Design a protein around this nucleic acid. Structure first.
Ligand SMILES: [Mg+2]
Ligand SMILES: [Mg+2]
Ligand SMILES: [Mg+2]
Ligand SMILES: [Mg+2]
Ligand SMILES: [Mg+2]
Ligand SMILES: [Mg+2]
Ligand SMILES: [Mg+2]
Ligand SMILES: [Mg+2]
Ligand SMILES: [Mg+2]
Ligand SMILES: [Mg+2]
Ligand SMILES: [Mg+2]
Ligand SMILES: [Mg+2]
Ligand SMILES: [Mg+2]
Ligand SMILES: [Mg+2]
Ligand SMILES: [Mg+2]
Ligand SMILES: [Mg+2]
Ligand SMILES: [Mg+2]
Ligand SMILES: [Mg+2]
Ligand SMILES: [Mg+2]
Ligand SMILES: [Mg+2]
Ligand SMILES: [Mg+2]
Ligand SMILES: [Mg+2]
Ligand SMILES: [Mg+2]
Ligand SMILES: [Mg+2]
Ligand SMILES: [Mg+2]
Ligand SMILES: [Mg+2]
Ligand SMILES: [Mg+2]
Ligand SMILES: [Mg+2]
Ligand SMILES: [Mg+2]
Ligand SMILES: [Mg+2]
Ligand SMILES: [Mg+2]
Ligand SMILES: [Mg+2]
Ligand SMILES: [Mg+2]
Ligand SMILES: [Mg+2]
Ligand SMILES: [Mg+2]
Ligand SMILES: [Mg+2]
Ligand SMILES: [Mg+2]
Ligand SMILES: [Mg+2]
Ligand SMILES: [Mg+2]
Ligand SMILES: [Mg+2]
Ligand SMILES: [Mg+2]
Ligand SMILES: [Mg+2]
Ligand SMILES: [Mg+2]
Ligand SMILES: [Mg+2]
Ligand SMILES: [Mg+2]
Ligand SMILES: [Mg+2]
Ligand SMILES: [Mg+2]
Ligand SMILES: [Mg+2]
Ligand SMILES: [Mg+2]
Ligand SMILES: [Mg+2]
Ligand SMILES: [Mg+2]
Ligand SMILES: [Mg+2]
Ligand SMILES: [Mg+2]
Ligand SMILES: [Mg+2]
Ligand SMILES: [Mg+2]
Ligand SMILES: [Mg+2]
Ligand SMILES: [Mg+2]
Ligand SMILES: [Mg+2]
Ligand SMILES: [Mg+2]
Ligand SMILES: [Mg+2]
Ligand SMILES: [Mg+2]
Ligand SMILES: [Mg+2]
Ligand SMILES: [Mg+2]
Ligand SMILES: [Mg+2]
Ligand SMILES: [Mg+2]
Ligand SMILES: [Mg+2]
Ligand SMILES: [Mg+2]
Ligand SMILES: [Mg+2]
Ligand SMILES: [Mg+2]
Ligand SMILES: [Mg+2]
Ligand SMILES: [Mg+2]
Ligand SMILES: [Mg+2]
Ligand SMILES: [Mg+2]
Ligand SMILES: [Mg+2]
Ligand SMILES: [Mg+2]
Ligand SMILES: [Mg+2]
Ligand SMILES: [Mg+2]
Ligand SMILES: [Mg+2]
Ligand SMILES: [Mg+2]
Ligand SMILES: [Mg+2]
Ligand SMILES: [Mg+2]
Ligand SMILES: [Mg+2]
Ligand SMILES: [Mg+2]
Ligand SMILES: [Mg+2]
Ligand SMILES: [Mg+2]
Ligand SMILES: [Mg+2]
Ligand SMILES: [Mg+2]
Ligand SMILES: [Mg+2]
Ligand SMILES: [Mg+2]
Ligand SMILES: [Mg+2]
Ligand SMILES: [Mg+2]
Ligand SMILES: [Mg+2]
Ligand SMILES: [Mg+2]
Ligand SMILES: [Mg+2]
Ligand SMILES: [Mg+2]
Ligand SMILES: [Mg+2]
Ligand SMILES: [Mg+2]
Ligand SMILES: [Mg+2]
Ligand SMILES: [Mg+2]
Ligand SMILES: [Mg+2]
Ligand SMILES: [Mg+2]
Ligand SMILES: [Mg+2]
Lengths: 146, 97
RNA sequence: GAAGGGGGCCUGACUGCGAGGCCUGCAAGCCGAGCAGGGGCGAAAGCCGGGCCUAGUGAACCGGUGGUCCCGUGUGGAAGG
RNA sequence: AGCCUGGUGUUGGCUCUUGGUCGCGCCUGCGUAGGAUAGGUGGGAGCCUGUGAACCCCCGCCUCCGGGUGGGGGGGAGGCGCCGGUGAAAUACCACCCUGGCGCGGCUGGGGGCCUAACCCUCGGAUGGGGGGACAGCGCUUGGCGGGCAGUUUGACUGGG
RNA sequence: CAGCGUAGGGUUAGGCGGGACCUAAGGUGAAGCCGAAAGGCGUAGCCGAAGGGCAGCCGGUUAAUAUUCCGGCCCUUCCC
RNA sequence: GGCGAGCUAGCCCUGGCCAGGGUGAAGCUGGGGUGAGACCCAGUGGAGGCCCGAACCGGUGGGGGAUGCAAACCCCUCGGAUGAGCUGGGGCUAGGAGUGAAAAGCUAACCGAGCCCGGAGAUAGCUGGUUCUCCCCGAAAUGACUUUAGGGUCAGCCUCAG
RNA sequence: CGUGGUUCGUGGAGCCAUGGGGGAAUCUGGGCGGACCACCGCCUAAGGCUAAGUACUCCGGGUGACCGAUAGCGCACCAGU
RNA sequence: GAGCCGGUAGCGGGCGUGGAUCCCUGGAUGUCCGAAUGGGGGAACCCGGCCGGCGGGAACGCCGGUCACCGCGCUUUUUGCGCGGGGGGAACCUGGGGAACUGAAACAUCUCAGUACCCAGAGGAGAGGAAAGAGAAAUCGACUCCCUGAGUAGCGGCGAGCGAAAGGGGACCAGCCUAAACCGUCCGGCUUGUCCGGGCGGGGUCGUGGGGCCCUCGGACACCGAAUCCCCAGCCUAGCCGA
RNA sequence: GGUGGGGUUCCCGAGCGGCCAAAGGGAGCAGACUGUAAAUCUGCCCGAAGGUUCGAAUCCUUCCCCCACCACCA
């Protein structure tokens, strides 16, 4: 008997998987325990509409980090820093990179999860990477003066 | 009232027919009736006890139609009442217009 | 003057019929010449449709089995008769 | 009628254990004889091994323990067959089969334990707790026991019966 | 003559009995349960008494009624 | 399919009734007894499907009655009479059913299956009965078969038409 | 599987119905023409309603080779008394 | 259209051509019981709540009104309200159940018989009805009823007995609504989604298969037409003239 | 009528493809022991026809009987 599963059951696998089973089970365990539902032409329909709606906004969300990959992976933000000899007085941080990328080239990042480790104290050419899920490396130029 | 609340099935009278001898088609001289008498045949009737809105509704049905109790539960719109409840969930919902 | 006993060849302990009668409430029971087919024994005339004879039996119905042509529920088959 | 009873519905979860059959695979058998420890029939002088052999070292199970047999491996370029004969058979390698066994897998079976959630009992208390539990109860169906009840049968002749 | 025909008259209660009180067997029965139909069952409730509870005694009077009318002496419950 | 437990049987609820005598259980008390007891003896006490006997409940024997006073009675006699007692009121159980200290008793004056109405004009190879008149003819009581023998079928014998 | 309906009493037993078990498809789908198979046809099940032609006679009327007070209704009458 | 105040005279009184009695239609009144329905109850009796009224009227009593249960419907479930049901009826009708005597010259299957009867329900009728039919003809067309087919075909301890249909002739005549596809709306659940579900409207209703959706065709007065509603004749419920 | 088992030296009884005078038991005979009787002990000794292989008590067909069982009877 065909039920739509409401959570992974360990042999009778994960959510939405249509599994067939002795009615007794269905009626007196799964169903009253809200841990599944019987697969009607009615409910099979919402399930399709449920898988569509998911993989819609899912591969919609992959339309950002595909779009921010094809912009930030060429454009370079250049950072002014009070100079020193191959050492910075302040520190350019995630926060800074964020802002600079905004005022300059007109883009917006979080800046959560870029490189949080050790806000960068030197000058040079760095490649930092952005996120979530397949994603983009960025070029950032820390230079001189103000 | 031993009758299925969904299907409508109720007890029928039937004859119970006692036969002797060998089928004509086994080369017997043919079957013979030593008796015929009325019996009845009940529906195979069960409790389906189910939870709908607040409440716990109990249908008495032929084991045959047991599925339709659950079909009727998949019909859910707006009842905060007491048992009855199925008075609603019933033939109003089985047929209506 | 065989229906008795012995021997030889044989399967008529045939098939298809059956004038005419015995008997007889019915239904049965009985005897039967003769013709046809194909035979047996006999040189032939002839005899042979079990046994000297009179008891050794059981209507119908229901069913079995073998065969045959007959019928086969729109039709051909088949089921079943 | 009642009672007993197989199948099946209501009727579920998890294991353990067994069949039956089918497909495939891996084996099994041995009369002195041929040299012996060759199931049957056919193909057959070609093979198989260096797609790492014989001979032993562990090890498995079978055995009429003559041993058969595979893996591990020490292991390194041989081991075979025809020929020959007192048993029909001929004793490599390749298939299709028999007899028994095991191995896995397929559909169906039969048992045993535990679980709980159907079902049943219960709890001044409940969308719950405890107990029993897929039994029992109940439907359909199987066969049985069944004067507890029912309907009837239980001849005629006859110096009355 | 009559228990007979015709006709006329005759039975007076806050306290006696019963009811505007209680419950018994049983009955009936919102809930609920069962049953082809009819209908069976059933908790509470309700009904149900010669049981429980509740305030009147003595006497006179009529052809015919009287703890009922009358006389005397007592009492009960509701309302304000 | 109904109607019946106003009779009768059992049970349920709730009331009532049983003159008067007699016998004298246990217990208690006292006294005796003993190491202590068992026990004994008194008095007290007032038990019991205990005794006699009215009411009440019965129905033993005999007589009478027998178109009765009476569809179960009357007389004499007799059993029980604090109990498994009797009895009023209110209730419940019924027809293959009830109820029965059990006779197949009782269940509205006949119960081996109640009454009523219906199926119903059941069936009756049996018994009875079958109604004006005149005319002609005029039998059988045998055979065969028959779950047949006092019933039938065919035959035989009567009759009527051609 | 168990039964009922039909003329069909298990019969070769279909058709219509359905208590039990299993349990589909949407025209290239389904049911039927008496087991079953082929062919050739018929029809479209699992929702519902639908006058009239028909049955009856409490009731009113009209007729009778219907009765005439033991008949005719049980009752001609103050009878379901 | 002249007598009347029933059967019913009588006593004692009254009425009518200013049209009585009497007949027909409508209305009003209509105690109590009874489905009986405020609640009880041994039918025709008893006891109440609510609002209003009467009496001196608080107690008491009377009067009017209202108050059972069930179903359906909306409604904010609720305060509720609306509409309905209930019971009776001679026979007739359908449906649920369903005998025996009897017949078989015994008796079980069989018969009696789906009778009697009990129960539910319907109405002036009820049932049935518009083919998943018939059944051998390229056949017929709903249903019911009569005649016939026919005591045929069959059924049957192939006994006793039971007993169809097609067709033909008549009577009457009629055919419709829906479900789904699809479209639109409202509401509900939500893991707002071209989502699922319920409600309503549209759409569609058939077997030379139909319908939905897309394209083209012109698809225009249209014609048809109720079983529903309205009017009318006619008929019924009193009478009247009448040689 | 059907199904399943059989058939072995005098009785029972196992009976297998490499022969199985054919296990075994008891019966019989002859020995040993002996109050009687025994118990113990030792020795003696393929239903049928056909058919498949080199080999048949073994496998098949068939036939005959036995046992067993189920079923039917107009
Ligand atoms: Mg049966
Ligand atoms: Mg359940
Ligand atoms: Mg099922
Ligand atoms: Mg001779
Ligand atoms: Mg002759
Ligand atoms: Mg000749
Ligand atoms: Mg016969
Ligand atoms: Mg025959
Ligand atoms: Mg001929
Ligand atoms: Mg022919
Ligand atoms: Mg045919
Ligand atoms: Mg044919
Ligand atoms: Mg356990
Ligand atoms: Mg537990
Ligand atoms: Mg408690
Ligand atoms: Mg629990
Ligand atoms: Mg069970
Ligand atoms: Mg008897
Ligand atoms: Mg018996
Ligand atoms: Mg005799
Ligand atoms: Mg004599
Ligand atoms: Mg004698
Ligand atoms: Mg007088
Ligand atoms: Mg007073
Ligand atoms: Mg009272
Ligand atoms: Mg009271
Ligand atoms: Mg009751
Ligand atoms: Mg009292
Ligand atoms: Mg009192
Ligand atoms: Mg008083
Ligand atoms: Mg006085
Ligand atoms: Mg007096
Ligand atoms: Mg006074
Ligand atoms: Mg009594
Ligand atoms: Mg006294
Ligand atoms: Mg003392
Ligand atoms: Mg004393
Ligand atoms: Mg005394
Ligand atoms: Mg005494
Ligand atoms: Mg005495
Ligand atoms: Mg005495
Ligand atoms: Mg006496
Ligand atoms: Mg006497
Ligand atoms: Mg006395
Ligand atoms: Mg005495
Ligand atoms: Mg009493
Ligand atoms: Mg009786
Ligand atoms: Mg009895
Ligand atoms: Mg009587
Ligand atoms: Mg009596
Ligand atoms: Mg009797
Ligand atoms: Mg008579
Ligand atoms: Mg009769
Ligand atoms: Mg008789
Ligand atoms: Mg003469
Ligand atoms: Mg005679
Ligand atoms: Mg006689
Ligand atoms: Mg005669
Ligand atoms: Mg039948
Ligand atoms: Mg049939
Ligand atoms: Mg028969
Ligand atoms: Mg067919
Ligand atoms: Mg069909
Ligand atoms: Mg057809
Ligand atoms: Mg057709
Ligand atoms: Mg259809
Ligand atoms: Mg239709
Ligand atoms: Mg109609
Ligand atoms: Mg009339
Ligand atoms: Mg007279
Ligand atoms: Mg008369
Ligand atoms: Mg006269
Ligand atoms: Mg009379
Ligand atoms: Mg006058
Ligand atoms: Mg006028
Ligand atoms: Mg009037
Ligand atoms: Mg009342
Ligand atoms: Mg009132
Ligand atoms: Mg009442
Ligand atoms: Mg008032
Ligand atoms: Mg009615
Ligand atoms: Mg009515
Ligand atoms: Mg009927
Ligand atoms: Mg009978
Ligand atoms: Mg009889
Ligand atoms: Mg008879
Ligand atoms: Mg007779
Ligand atoms: Mg008899
Ligand atoms: Mg019949
Ligand atoms: Mg009506
Ligand atoms: Mg009509
Ligand atoms: Mg209809
Ligand atoms: Mg009949
Ligand atoms: Mg016709
Ligand atoms: Mg027409
Ligand atoms: Mg519509
Ligand atoms: Mg929608
Ligand atoms: Mg619609
Ligand atoms: Mg529409
Ligand atoms: Mg199309
Ligand atoms: Mg005139
Ligand atoms: Mg000696």
């Amino acid at each position: 008997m065909k039920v739509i599963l409401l959570e992974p059951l360990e042999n009778l696998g994960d959510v939405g998987q249509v599994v067939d089973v002795k009615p007794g089970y269905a009626r007196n365990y799964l169903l009253p325990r809200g841990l599944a539902v019987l697969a009607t032409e009615s409910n099979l329909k919402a399930l399709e509409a449920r898988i569509r709606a998911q993989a819609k906004r899912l591969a919609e969300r992959k339309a950002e980090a595909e779009r921010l990959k094809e912009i930030l992976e060429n454009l370079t933000l250049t950072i002014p820093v009070r100079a020193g000899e191959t050492k910075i007085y302040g520190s350019v941080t995630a926060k800074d990179i964020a802002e600079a990328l905004s005022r300059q080239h007109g883009v917006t990042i979080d800046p959560k999860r870029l490189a949080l480790e050790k806000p960068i104290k030197e000058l040079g050419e760095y490649v930092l990477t952005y996120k979530p899920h397949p994603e983009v490396p960025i070029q950032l130029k820390v230079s001189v003066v103000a | 009232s031993k009758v299925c609340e969904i299907s409508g099935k109720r007890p029928i009278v039937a004859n119970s027919i006692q036969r002797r001898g060998k089928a004509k088609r086994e080369g017997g001289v043919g079957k013979k009736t030593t008796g015929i008498s009325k019996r009845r045949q009940y529906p195979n009737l069960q409790k389906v006890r189910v939870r709908v809105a607040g409440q716990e509704i109990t249908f008495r049905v032929a084991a045959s139609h047991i599925p339709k109790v659950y079909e009727l539960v998949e019909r859910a719109k707006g009842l905060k009442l007491e048992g009855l409840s199925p008075k609603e969930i019933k033939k109003e919902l089985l047929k209506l217009l």
